Structures are given as structure tokens and as C-alpha cells.
Scaffold this active site. Structure first.
Site, PDB file in Angstrom:
ATOM      1  N   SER A  38      15.141  43.748  29.062  1.00  0.00           N
ATOM      2  CA  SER A  38      16.149  42.870  29.706  1.00  0.00           C
ATOM      3  C   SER A  38      16.348  43.162  31.211  1.00  0.00           C
ATOM      4  O   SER A  38      17.181  42.529  31.838  1.00  0.00           O
ATOM      5  CB  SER A  38      17.491  43.058  28.982  1.00  0.00           C
ATOM      6  OG  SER A  38      17.723  44.446  28.867  1.00  0.00           O
ATOM      7  N   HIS A  64      20.358  37.784  21.319  1.00  0.00           N
ATOM      8  CA  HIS A  64      20.495  38.670  20.159  1.00  0.00           C
ATOM      9  C   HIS A  64      20.765  37.973  18.864  1.00  0.00           C
ATOM     10  O   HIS A  64      20.589  38.583  17.804  1.00  0.00           O
ATOM     11  CB  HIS A  64      21.652  39.681  20.442  1.00  0.00           C
ATOM     12  CG  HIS A  64      21.580  40.219  21.853  1.00  0.00           C
ATOM     13  ND1 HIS A  64      22.224  39.590  22.893  1.00  0.00           N
ATOM     14  CD2 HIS A  64      20.902  41.269  22.409  1.00  0.00           C
ATOM     15  CE1 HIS A  64      21.926  40.187  24.029  1.00  0.00           C
ATOM     16  NE2 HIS A  64      21.144  41.231  23.764  1.00  0.00           N
ATOM     17  N   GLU A  84      22.775  42.112  17.372  1.00  0.00           N
ATOM     18  CA  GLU A  84      21.678  41.551  16.592  1.00  0.00           C
ATOM     19  C   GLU A  84      21.886  41.914  15.122  1.00  0.00           C
ATOM     20  O   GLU A  84      21.660  41.103  14.238  1.00  0.00           O
ATOM     21  CB  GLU A  84      20.323  42.105  17.031  1.00  0.00           C
ATOM     22  CG  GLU A  84      19.162  41.510  16.194  1.00  0.00           C
ATOM     23  CD  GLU A  84      17.808  42.153  16.497  1.00  0.00           C
ATOM     24  OE1 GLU A  84      16.988  42.288  15.551  1.00  0.00           O
ATOM     25  OE2 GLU A  84      17.559  42.468  17.651  1.00  0.00           O
ATOM     26  N   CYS A 132      10.624  40.487  28.594  1.00  0.00           N
ATOM     27  CA  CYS A 132       9.829  40.033  27.482  1.00  0.00           C
ATOM     28  C   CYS A 132      10.022  38.515  27.415  1.00  0.00           C
ATOM     29  O   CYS A 132      10.828  37.956  28.207  1.00  0.00           O
ATOM     30  CB  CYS A 132      10.397  40.633  26.159  1.00  0.00           C
ATOM     31  SG  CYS A 132      12.145  40.252  25.887  1.00  0.00           S
ATOM     32  N   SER A 173      21.822  48.366  26.230  1.00  0.00           N
ATOM     33  CA  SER A 173      20.491  47.770  25.827  1.00  0.00           C
ATOM     34  C   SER A 173      19.835  48.720  24.825  1.00  0.00           C
ATOM     35  O   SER A 173      19.409  49.855  25.197  1.00  0.00           O
ATOM     36  CB  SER A 173      19.620  47.595  27.028  1.00  0.00           C
ATOM     37  OG  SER A 173      18.278  47.253  26.653  1.00  0.00           O
ATOM     38  N   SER A 174      19.770  48.265  23.599  1.00  0.00           N
ATOM     39  CA  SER A 174      19.172  49.057  22.504  1.00  0.00           C
ATOM     40  C   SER A 174      17.711  49.404  22.842  1.00  0.00           C
ATOM     41  O   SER A 174      17.318  50.594  22.841  1.00  0.00           O
ATOM     42  CB  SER A 174      19.236  48.197  21.241  1.00  0.00           C
ATOM     43  OG  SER A 174      18.634  48.862  20.125  1.00  0.00           O
TER      44      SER A 174
HETATM   45  C1  LIG Z   1      17.670  40.072  22.563  1.00  0.00           C
HETATM   46  C2  LIG Z   1      17.026  41.366  22.231  1.00  0.00           C
HETATM   47  C3  LIG Z   1      16.493  42.240  23.143  1.00  0.00           C
HETATM   48  C4  LIG Z   1      16.336  42.106  24.624  1.00  0.00           C
HETATM   49  O1  LIG Z   1      16.964  43.207  25.278  1.00  0.00           O
HETATM   50  P1  LIG Z   1      18.566  43.444  25.368  1.00  0.00           P
HETATM   51  O2  LIG Z   1      18.707  44.727  26.176  1.00  0.00           O
HETATM   52  O3  LIG Z   1      19.121  42.222  25.935  1.00  0.00           O
HETATM   53  O4  LIG Z   1      19.025  43.557  23.829  1.00  0.00           O
HETATM   54  P2  LIG Z   1      18.871  44.843  22.871  1.00  0.00           P
HETATM   55  O5  LIG Z   1      17.573  45.645  23.111  1.00  0.00           O
HETATM   56  O6  LIG Z   1      18.940  44.232  21.494  1.00  0.00           O
HETATM   57  O7  LIG Z   1      20.118  45.681  23.129  1.00  0.00           O
HETATM   58  C5  LIG Z   1      17.110  41.706  20.759  1.00  0.00           C
HETATM   59  O8  LIG Z   1      15.831  41.068  20.216  1.00  0.00           O
HETATM   60  S1  SF4 Z   2      12.951  42.283  22.728  1.00  0.00           S
HETATM   61 FE1  SF4 Z   2      14.179  40.817  21.552  1.00  0.00          FE
HETATM   62  S2  SF4 Z   2      14.210  39.040  23.033  1.00  0.00           S
HETATM   63 FE2  SF4 Z   2      12.555  40.303  23.619  1.00  0.00          FE
HETATM   64  S3  SF4 Z   2      10.764  39.499  22.716  1.00  0.00           S
HETATM   65 FE3  SF4 Z   2      11.593  41.160  21.327  1.00  0.00          FE
HETATM   66  S4  SF4 Z   2      12.789  40.048  19.869  1.00  0.00           S
HETATM   67 FE4  SF4 Z   2      12.536  38.682  21.528  1.00  0.00          FE
END
Ligand SMILES: C/C(=C\COP(=O)(O)OP(=O)(O)O)CO
Ligand code: SF4
EC number: 1.17.7.4
Length: 309
Positions: A269, A74, A126, A12, A225-226
């Protein structure tokens, strides 16, 4: 076996920006570059950045004076940010703009001494960062993860109440939580819908379409990864076998034996090369050409700060 690819999938805007921030800092200032928390929740990315001289820490104490520190995508709490500011550290912020947007609202309610409720998962960075934007003892900052949590929450002044959400939640489950919030606190104020970002919403819509065709769904993404877990969860709830995997090596033959249609997607991610390698493995297991499903075209990009370009 037919191999279908979800669209959109993978990186993203906020993840691509955050990874670039750390890569650029390494090229400009050299190793080591300190990063508060995994820049993004992906083992392949993190392991690689470690290689190039990034050092991932949880607490600012871990960072030496004179160092360069990057906050992960995050986000971080005001306490962390201030601790970093009180130290003699050069700071770059890779927090995604869509997380910062939520932070600004929480700070506003804190300044007003008015209570806020965050929908999210306890322990996630986050959620720690967003809850950490509230510091007014007169008001309050509460976390709810489910309708049951809402049913048990009491606040000081429900006439002045607002809500926010984590950016990576299940769209459907958050809807249920909000419904509960509005029944319990009819004067509660929030955004038009929630703070779930475009990338989360789009990847969940895309996995929904993928799962209606595939018997099995592989989601490329790390365990922590959420957003990636929400994609496997969604396919599972649709009655499909779904597996969250870091790379092709994790694929067990039994998962796809005699399966006519296997779907692949990736969390926000996960780099595209991991998906390419997963496709290659499925092909050696009998799959044919990967077919991309039609999907919502994404066009948003977030540039790195000028100081790092
Ligand atoms: C930075 C972010 C998401 C990008 O994927 P991530 O897998 O790095 O983080 P998350 O899904 O929160 O565990 C939270 O907006
Ligand atoms: S998943 Fe998290 S890092 Fe990616 S675009 Fe959404 S808010 Fe931003």
C-alpha cells in the site's frame, strides 16, 4: 554504504485499483466521497485523499443519505454491505478481487451449513469482512491465528470442514497453521496452498533475498498495514535490524551509522515516491546509488469499474 532495493516492492494490483476508484469518484462526483475504512493502509495516501475531499468512516451510520460510498480494498461483511444497500446510498466496491475470491468461498460454505475456519489476525478489517460472509447458525465460522489455536479448536462436524486465509499473512507461519489443521482435521478441504496473494508472496520472497545481503532493512509502510508488518517481521527473524517507517523523516541516524549495506522495500500500500524519498535520505546519510535487486516480474492489473472510468 550500499543501498539495495527489493523487487518486487510497493503497489500491488488491488491497491492501485482501489486508490484509482476513490480518485476517479472524486473527479466525477466531486467532494465529499465517503469511504468505509482507509481505502488502503497508508497514511500518505489516506491523508492526501482526505485533502481532495474523501471522508473515511467505520460505520455506515456515519454516512448521510444520498451519499456516494466506496468500500475499502480490504472488503466488508455482508451485514455492512446490506446495511449500505438498505440505505439510499450509491455504492462502489474497491474490495480487491483476490479478497472477493475468498469471500465467495466462505458464502458457499455458509449456504451449505458447513463449517469453515479462517486463518488470520483478529481485529483486522479483512478478517472482519471475510468472517462476515458466514451467517448460517447450523454451521460455524472459526478464526485461528496460530497452531496453538488449532490445537484448542473443536467443531461440530469435522467431516465437512474447509479453510480459508487472510491474503496478507506470513507465508511461513501460515504453512505451520495449515500443517496443524491437517493433522487435527484430516478431512479438511482448502485451496492447493492458501489464499495468500501473489503480491504478499512476492514481497516476502523479495525481502528474504534483500535481508540476506543487507544488515538493516527499512520497510516503507504504515503501522496498520498487515502485509507491511510481515515484511519487517521476516527480516527481523533473519537477524537483521528492520524498521517499519512511513517516510524518510522516521529514519534515525543510529540505525544506519557505519552500516555497509542497507536494504529498502515497501509494503503493497506504499507509493513509490515514499521509497524515492527514503533513498534520498539514506544518500544524505552516506549511501550511494540505489541498486535494484533482480526479481519476479509482476504483470497483473485490475481495472476500475467502467462506471468510474
Ligand atoms: C487490501 C489488502 C492489502 C493491501 O495493503 P494494506 O496495507 O492496505 O492492507 P493490509 O496488508 O491488509 O493491512 C488486503 O488484501
Ligand atoms: S495485497 Fe491485498 S489488495 Fe493487494 S493484490 Fe493482494 S489481495 Fe489484492
Amino acid at each position: 554504504m550500499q543501498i539495495l532495493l527489493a523487487n518486487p516492492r510497493g503497489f500491488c494490483a488491488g491497491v492501485d485499483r482501489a486508490i484509482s476508484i476513490v480518485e476517479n469518484a472524486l473527479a466525477i462526483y466531486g467532494a465529499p466521497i465517503y469511504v468505509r475504512h482507509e481505502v488502503v493502509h497508508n497514511r500518505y495516501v489516506v491523508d492526501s485523499l482526505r485533502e481532495r475531499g474523501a471522508i473515511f468512516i467505520e460505520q455506515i451510520s456515519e454516512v448521510p443519505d444520498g451519499a456516494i460510498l466506496i468500500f475499502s480494498a480490504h472488503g466488508v461483511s455482508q451485514a455492512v454491505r446490506n446495511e449500505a444497500k438498505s440505505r439510499d446510498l450509491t455504492v462502489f466496491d474497491a474490495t480487491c478481487p483476490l479478497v472477493t475470491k475468498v469471500h465467495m468461498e466462505v458464502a458457499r460454505a455458509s449456504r451449505r451449513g458447513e463449517e469453515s475456519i479462517l486463518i488470520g489476525h483478529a481485529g483486522h478489517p479483512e478478517v472482519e469482512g471475510t468472517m462476515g460472509q458466514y451467517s448460517n447458525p447450523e454451521g460455524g465460522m472459526y478464526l485461528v491465528e496460530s497452531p496453538d489455536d488449532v490445537w484448542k479448536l473443536t467443531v461440530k462436524n469435522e467431516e465437512k470442514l474447509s479453510f480459508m486465509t487472510q491474503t496478507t499473512l506470513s507465508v511461513d507461519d501460515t504453512s505451520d497453521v495449515i500443517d496443524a489443521l491437517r493433522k487435527r482435521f484430516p478431512k479438511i478441504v482448502g485451496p492447493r496452498k492458501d489464499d495468500i496473494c501473489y503480491a504478499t508472496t512476492n514481497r516476502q520472497e523479495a525481502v528474504r533475498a534483500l535481508a540476506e545481503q543487507a544488515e538493516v532493512v527499512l520497510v516503507v509502510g504504515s503501522k496498520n498495514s498487515s502485509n507491511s508488518n510481515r515484511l519487517a517481521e521476516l527480516a527481523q527473524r533473519m537477524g537483521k535490524r528492520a524498521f517499519l517507517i512511513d517516510d524518510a523523516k522516521d529514519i534515525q541516524e543510529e540505525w544506519v551509522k557505519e552500516v555497509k549495506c542497507v536494504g529498502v522495500t515497501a509494503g503493497a500500500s506504499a507509493p513509490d515516491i515514499l521509497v524515492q524519498n527514503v533513498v534520498a535520505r539514506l544518500q544524505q546519510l552516506g549511501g550511494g546509488e540505489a541498486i535494484p535487486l533482480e526479481g519476479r516480474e509482476e504483470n497483473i492489473v485490475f481495472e476500475v469499474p467502467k462506471e468510474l472510468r
